[PDB]
């Protein structure tokens, strides 16, 4: 049966040892070691130019931790004791102890540049400024996870009596705004496997009874989460509630299956870190325990791809021993067109609302549009070679540039389809009129 527990982004259990990771993100990670009745904590950064790695001793046994590029926040789930540490020396650290009801415990904590947030098993929400001045208290579903990027904050909530849900908000200093409040979440649960399989990974489920492996904002503020099924999900169109939707953008298991030559190397596990545009930052872990250890192994990089393939069909198409399986060009072109379309739309929405950060992202969008038409031309040519004029004509509507339509005319000539040459030229003339208008 379910029970409430604390969480922090991508921590590890102690396992057999006296040390563990508390949390990880793109900026860095935090670790701690137990020394009889005391603990030692160490904070690490990947930008070694901008920050200093450092360490200090904890007597109170913190079990909660949250990191950003301004400071680190620490908490104790039973005692209610908390501490915030800026990365500069100038603003000295400060501490507080929060009231708790009998058996109540803190489940998660998070912080913006000016806001501090605490949640509990009994569904109480409390908030303070960067100097601990209390602002407000609210009663909600029990919270299980929290994350933030500048003023944008993303929350997850769960109850036996209300289901699984999420919230999205923006703590603007001009004003605070809610985009979603405890709306239903479609995430894949792990409980059936935990109850039936008896896999001796039970310690991980004790450590993380929700099985939510990690969650973070993209490099452009999109909300993202990695499921217990080892799939990456991203929320699209969040700015428009009648169009907002959840998208499955990468399955790790399918990648390892292809990488192994179509084999079941279950000894390999993927530990996610952060999402950089189109590429996942992750650790590839091997052996008994599905999470990394010390000293930290080097990260890896991996691209997202749409779920379109089938194992049996690809085995049939395929049919040195570990060679990665060969794929039909139709699947590759189809997947590219879908991936190009989704990427372009997300980038377009980002530019439409938040603009360019660097001054060149429009060029990437142009490249995506070129890739999109290129993929469609290959699929179109396949339809023409099959002499399916109806399907080829339907595909021709989706092409953007007249360069591509001209190429489609040449392709139709090679296919010896003058009817399709005619109808494409009708479309080109119609679209030329629309361009003249």
């Amino acid at each position: 049966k379910f029970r409430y527990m604390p969480f922090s982004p991508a921590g590890t259990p102690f396992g057999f040892t006296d040390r563990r990771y508390l949390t990880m993100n793109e900026v860095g990670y935090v670790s701690t070691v137990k020394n009889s009745e005391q603990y030692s904590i160490t904070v690490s950064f990947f930008d070694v130019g901008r920050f200093r790695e450092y360490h200090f001793e904890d007597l109170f046994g913190y079990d909660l931790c949250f990191l950003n590029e301004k400071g680190t926040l620490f908490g104790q789930s039973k005692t209610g004791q908390i501490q915030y540490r800026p990365h500069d020396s100038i603003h000295s650290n400060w501490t507080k102890i929060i009231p708790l009801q009998a058996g109540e415990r803190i489940t998660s904590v998070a912080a913006t540049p000016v806001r501090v947030i605490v949640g509990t098993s009994l569904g109480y929400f409390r908030s303070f400024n960067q100097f601990g001045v209390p602002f407000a208290v609210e009663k909600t579903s029990p919270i299980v996870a929290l994350t933030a990027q500048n003023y944008r904050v993303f929350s997850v909530h769960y109850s036996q009596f209300h289901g699984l849900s999420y919230s999205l908000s923006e703590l603007g200093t001009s004003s605070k705004r809610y985009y979603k409040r405890e709306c239903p979440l479609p995430m894949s649960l792990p409980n059936i496997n935990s109850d039936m399989k008896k896999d001796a990974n039970l310690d991980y489920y004790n450590f993380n009874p929700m099985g939510i492996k990690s969650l973070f904002f993209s490099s452009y503020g999109d909300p993202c989460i990695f499921g217990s099924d080892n799939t990456l999900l991203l929320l699209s169109k969040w700015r428009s509630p009648e169009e907002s939707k959840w998208l499955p953008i990468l399955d790790s298991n399918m990648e390892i299956w292809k990488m192994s030559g179509g084999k079941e190397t279950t000894d390999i596990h993927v530990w996610p870190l952060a999402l950089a545009y189109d590429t996942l930052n992750c650790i590839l872990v091997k052996g008994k325990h599905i999470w990394p250890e010390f000293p930290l192994p080097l990260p890896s990089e991996m691209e997202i791809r749409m779920p379109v393939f089938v194992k049996s069909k690809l085995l049939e198409e395929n049919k040195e021993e570990d060679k990665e399986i060969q794929i039909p060009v139709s699947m590759a072109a189809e997947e590219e067109y879908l991936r190009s379309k989704v990427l372009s739309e997300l980038l377009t929405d980002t530019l439409e609302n938040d603009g360019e950060m660097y001054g060149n992202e429009n060029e990437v969008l142009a490249a995506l549009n070129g890739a999109y038409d290129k993929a469609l031309l290959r699929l179109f040519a396949s339809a023409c070679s099959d002499q399916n004029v109806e399907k080829a004509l339907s595909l021709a509507h989706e092409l953007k540039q007249d360069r591509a339509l001209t190429a489609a005319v040449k392709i139709s000539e090679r296919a010896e389809l003058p009817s399709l040459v005619k109808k494409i030229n009708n479309i080109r003339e119609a679209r030329y009129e629309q361009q003249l208008k």
Binding site: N35, R52, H55, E293
Partner: protein, 565 residues
């Protein structure tokens, strides 16, 4: 001027900033040879600066006499200078040929802080601090652990008030502050901290901690245990935390040719246990000689008797410890628990640090420091000969520096081979001193003078002389319960016709509460200031002096007549 623990970081920052230019050698390090802690300290610093690409020069120095010489010749563009292991006891602005008006660049109108063209940094564990250096100076910059603000309230007050004061009230106030300062000054000399330890805190601050720096920390620290046990005991727990912190996960995995480990396990106050043999380990131990009186046969038979009762065949106890049988090696840790009590010898058991690298076998820090000191001692008209001797002793600094590198274990083995011979030769002199009863028991202190020997040249180096003194001190500490006394030890040289003299304190047994202080400093200084005698004082350690053959007896006569002992 001085900085504290809360800002050592800032001096390091200032030094980086201050010594920036690549057109010149903008940073210089002066280091005292014949000091292990100083050596490890310096090594740490050089690595630090290496990483930062700071062009610099390292110069080893013997004493005050050479200090002046080296300082004199310095270039004007030398923005930063470091004094490592000396100078905290003396007025440096007085000693050096300094006018501050010759070194001020800029005066900060706001702070009143004077920016000097050359900054002089001091790292020294010795106490008491010279007040002029701390309170007085603007060029001199000392690093202190808190001893200054913990200790020096009355003194700070007195210094400043005495300075500011320049009829009943005036007389009373000046006599008061003269009293304060005179009470502070002319105390005994003492060592209160580890150089390398302080450095390690800075490395901690910055974030430069690793096993290569922690091991140097341990080595530096460990050199204190023989003479300054109290200090060592204060420091020790910190080391355990660090060793437990930096040791990796997945412990007790299978070996590889690349695997390095550092771990806490038993160590024994036995002279170089993992080299030579078990029997030699007991026989030459400095503690065992005081506990069982090995200078005579009624002592040696006790050792034979012990091995017979312990169940170790005496012909195997003399085998080389690497080749000794595996079963005895693993059973030894329990055999000692059953047998050392009957000989009053339980203090042999303790914990220490051991390091191993690949397949080449273990070594403990306690053994390592003996190898390094041996290399310092024996590595390979009157003024010219003294210069040649003091120059030879400086080459051994580099013969020891190059042995701190894992790529050069070949040199470390040579160091160990020399250490064994040094202890052998020391023991063969100690027995002669005791059996001929050359110790003279004067009322105030104990006197001993070596007029001849099998080869008396070995005692011409200060470190060897101190090893012999530390042998005799353990013997005197355990031979009777009564009369903890100062001791004076001297050795003649046939080329100079001068006696090399050292003044040594007593100390309390290992197993037993403020520390005592060495008072020979002020006594030798006062007799030197008074005396007709031809004498020399230029060593960093002021408890060691030199005097001509005919002048030893009048000097010692004036010394014993003095109330300063």
């Amino acid at each position: 001027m001085y900085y504290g623990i809360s800002q050592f970081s800032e001096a390091y920052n200032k030094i980086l900033r201050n010594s920036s230019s690549h057109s010149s050698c903008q940073l210089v390090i002066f280091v005292s040879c014949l000091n292990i802690d100083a050596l490890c300290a310096t090594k740490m610093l050089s690595l630090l600066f290496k990483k930062q690409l700071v062009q610099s020069q390292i110069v080893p120095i013997f004493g005050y006499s050479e200090l002046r010489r080296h300082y004199s010749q310095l270039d004007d563009n030398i923005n930063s200078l470091l004094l490592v292991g000396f100078g905290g006891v003396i007025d440096l602005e007085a000693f050096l040929e300094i006018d501050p008006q010759e070194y001020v660049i800029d005066t900060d109108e706001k702070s009143g802080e004077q920016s000097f063209r050359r900054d002089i940094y001091v790292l020294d564990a010795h106490r008491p601090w010279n007040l002029d250096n701390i309170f007085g100076s603007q060029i001199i910059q000392c690093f202190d652990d808190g001893t200054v603000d913990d200790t020096l309230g009355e003194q700070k007050e007195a210094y400043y008030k005495l300075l500011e004061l320049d009829r009943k009230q005036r007389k009373k106030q000046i006599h008061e502050y003269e009293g304060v300062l005179e009470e502070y000054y002319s105390q005994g000399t003492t060592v209160v901290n580890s150089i390398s330890a302080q450095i390690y805190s800075l490395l901690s601050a910055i974030g430069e901690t690793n096993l290569s720096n922690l091991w140097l920390n341990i080595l530096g620290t460990t050199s204190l245990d023989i003479a300054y046990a109290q200090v060592y005991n204060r420091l020790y727990p910190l080391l355990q935390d660090e060793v437990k912190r930096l040791t990796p996960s997945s412990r007790n995995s299978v070996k590889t040719p690349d695997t390095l480990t550092l771990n806490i396990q038993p160590d024994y106050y036995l002279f170089l246990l993992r080299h030579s043999s078990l029997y030699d380990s007991f026989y030459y131990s400095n503690y065992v000689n005081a506990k069982l009186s090995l200078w005579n046969e009624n002592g040696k038979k006790r050792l034979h008797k012990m091995f017979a009762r312990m169940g170790i065949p005496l012909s195997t106890a003399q085998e080389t410890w690497l080749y000794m049988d595996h079963s005895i090696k693993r059973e030894l840790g329990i055999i000692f628990d059953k047998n050392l009590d009957r000989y009053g010898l339980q203090d042999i058991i303790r914990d220490g640090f051991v390091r191993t690298l690949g397949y080449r076998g273990s070594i403990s820090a306690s053994e390592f420091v003996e190898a390094l000191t041996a290399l310092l001692e024996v590595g390979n008209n009157s003024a010219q000969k003294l210069t040649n001797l003091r120059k030879r002793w400086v080459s051994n600094f580099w013969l020891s520096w190059d042995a701190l590198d894992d790529r050069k274990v070949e040199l470390l083995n040579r160091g160990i081979q020399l250490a064994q011979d040094l202890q052998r030769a020391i023991f063969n002199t100690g027995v002669a001193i005791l059996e001929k009863k050359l110790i003279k028991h004067l009322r105030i202190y104990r006197l001993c003078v070596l007029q001849d020997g099998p080869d008396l040249d070995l005692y011409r180096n200060p470190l060897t002389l101190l090893r012999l003194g530390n042998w005799l001190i353990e013997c005197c500490a355990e031979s009777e319960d009564k009369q903890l006394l100062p001791m004076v030890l001297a050795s003649i040289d046939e080329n100079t016709d001068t006696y090399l003299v050292a003044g040594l304190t007593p100390r309390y047994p290992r197993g037993l509460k403020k520390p005592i202080l060495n008072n020979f400093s002020m006594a030798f200084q006062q007799i030197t200031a008074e005396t007709d005698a031809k004498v020399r004082i230029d060593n960093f350690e002021s408890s060691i002096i030199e005097i001509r053959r005919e002048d030893l007896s009048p000097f010692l006569e004036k010394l014993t007549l003095s109330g300063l002992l």
